[PDB]
């Protein structure tokens, strides 16, 4: 049994995490009470990866809900699948992080981090073979950004030989809460570079554009954006949650997707983009999958090169045709794949499709074009930091200007590292 411990921190991390558990509980036939009511035994072959079996054939998610405010977690407990989580796994504070990285990471989250690790330890001790942890959070706030990275750093100290995986939501001025989001994002990115094995870069700018340009939504809400995240998270965990001839685990993904330890930020993609009765052919799935308009990272793949690519097709389809279309993409646009990593595109097919779709495809790409995302964050960071604007919110929590300068340098170094492998 290769179990995964799920952690969700902050408002964004819990709302996105709650939707993720709502989606995959439906896929595994788990009702909000926690009882299995499915048909196929394939829904329970690897149910232990994300669920713990309780007395009376009850399935409880191996999830830990963390926040410095009680508001969002009260919504989750009152949500559709709120009754499925362990009451013990609700670890929350009262003051909040105030959209401040320092409060999450240094002052307010420090008071709460130890109690979270006790729940992490309680879940890890009851695992036959713990393969790692996955964290859902945003980088532009204070709790998921500040405390989440603090949790990652402390979890690595206690579990150094386990895989750290994150679903990290990048801030964007298009969908913005505070002007200090570039500060929080730049501080978090430096943490993610050193302490995570795989990070799915979910850009709120990309999610907004997909809802606006593609799905034709004039005023997208966070629910609309989180619908795209749920589809992506379900897709990128399909190989973990469903049986296949690949025996997929987190470590194997990291070994094959990450050729250099710091370049572990993946571009997720999904097809078809949904917000609907016509079936999608395999050539259509492959074309949309590599299309920039289906990318969740707001980067143009044609502006860089793919180091490694992992693709997941879901539904009853011709595996012969899937290999035809995947090879067609590589042989056509071979200039967008590195020629010094042979066979850097992996394809897996799962017979069980997501809810409401006959055919779907999920894209996981380690493209050097992701530097555009870090360039965008860096430019927004520098424009404020050159004038030391809003810095008092952080120096009042004990931080120093030097820490921001180091984070800025690490951010620009990461762009330099992604740039050298583009030639």
């Amino acid at each position: 049994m290769r179990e995964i411990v799920h952690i969700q921190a902050g408002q964004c991390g819990n709302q996105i995490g709650a939707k993720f558990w709502e989606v995959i509980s439906d896929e595994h036939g788990i009702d909000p009470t926690g009882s299995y009511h499915g048909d196929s035994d394939l829904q329970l072959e690897r149910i232990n990866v994300y669920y713990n079996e309780a007395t009376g054939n009850k399935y409880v998610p191996r999830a830990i809900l963390v926040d410095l405010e009680p508001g969002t977690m009260d919504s989750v407990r009152s949500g559709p699948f709120g009754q499925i989580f362990r009451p013990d796994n609700f670890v929350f504070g009262q003051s909040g992080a105030g959209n401040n990285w320092a409060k999450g990471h240094y002052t307010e989250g420090a008071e709460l981090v130890d109690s979270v690790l006790d729940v992490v330890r309680k879940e890890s001790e009851s695992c036959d073979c713990l393969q790692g942890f996955q964290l859902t959070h945003s980088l532009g706030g204070g709790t998921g950004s500040g405390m989440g990275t603090l949790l990652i750093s402390k979890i690595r100290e206690e579990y150094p030989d386990r895989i750290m995986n994150t679903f990290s939501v990048m801030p964007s001025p298009k969908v913005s809460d505070t002007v200090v989001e570039p500060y929080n994002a730049t501080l978090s990115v430096h943490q993610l570079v050193e302490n995570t094995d795989e990070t799915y870069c979910i850009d709120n700018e990309a999610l907004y554009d997909i809802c606006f340009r593609t799905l034709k939504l004039t005023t997208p809400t966070y629910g609309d954006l989180n619908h795209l995240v749920s589809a992506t998270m379900s897709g990128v965990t399909t190989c973990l949650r469903f049986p296949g001839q690949l025996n997929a685990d987190l470590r194997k993904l990291a070994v094959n997707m990450v050729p250099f330890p710091r370049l572990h930020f993946f571009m997720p993609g999904f097809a078809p983009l949904t917000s609907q009765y016509r079936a999608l052919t395999v050539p259509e799935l492959t074309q949309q999958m590599f299309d920039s308009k289906n990318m969740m990272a707001a980067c143009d793949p044609r502006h860089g090169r793919y180091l490694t690519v992992a693709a997941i097709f879901r539904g009853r389809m011709s595996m012969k045709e899937v290999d035809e279309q995947m090879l067609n993409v590589q042989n056509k646009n071979s200039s967008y794949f590195v020629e010094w990593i042979p066979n850097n595109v992996k394809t897996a097919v799962c017979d069980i499709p997501p809810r409401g779709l006959k055919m779907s495809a999920t894209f996981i790409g380690n493209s050097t074009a992701i530097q555009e995302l870090f360039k965008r964050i860096s430019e927004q960071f520098t424009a404020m930091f050159r004038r030391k604007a809003f810095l008092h919110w952080y120096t009042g929590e004990g931080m120093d200007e030097m820490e921001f300068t180091e984070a800025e340098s690490n951010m620009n170094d990461l762009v330099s590292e992604y740039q050298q492998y583009q030639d």
Binding site: A110, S153, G396, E397
Partner: protein, 69 residues
């Protein structure tokens, strides 16, 4: 990294405690300086008035000197 985390939260406490200390000392200085100043002005006013009484007790002293002559 753990050492840096302790130093940041200790620096935050030190600067908040220093802010409370600086305000308490500044206010104590101002209230003490104000009390000394206002008392010094009232003392000066009473000094002039008590000097006037000395001049009044002296003007009467001159009339008693000349009425008996």
């Amino acid at each position: 990294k753990r050492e840096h985390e302790r130093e940041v939260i200790q620096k935050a406490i030190e600067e908040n405690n220093n802010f409370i200390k600086m305000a308490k000392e500044k206010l104590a200085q101002k209230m003490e300086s104000n009390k000394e100043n206002r008392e010094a002005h009232l003392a000066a006013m009473l000094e002039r008035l008590q000097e006037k009484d000395k001049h009044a007790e002296e003007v009467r002293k001159n009339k008693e000197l000349k009425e008996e002559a």
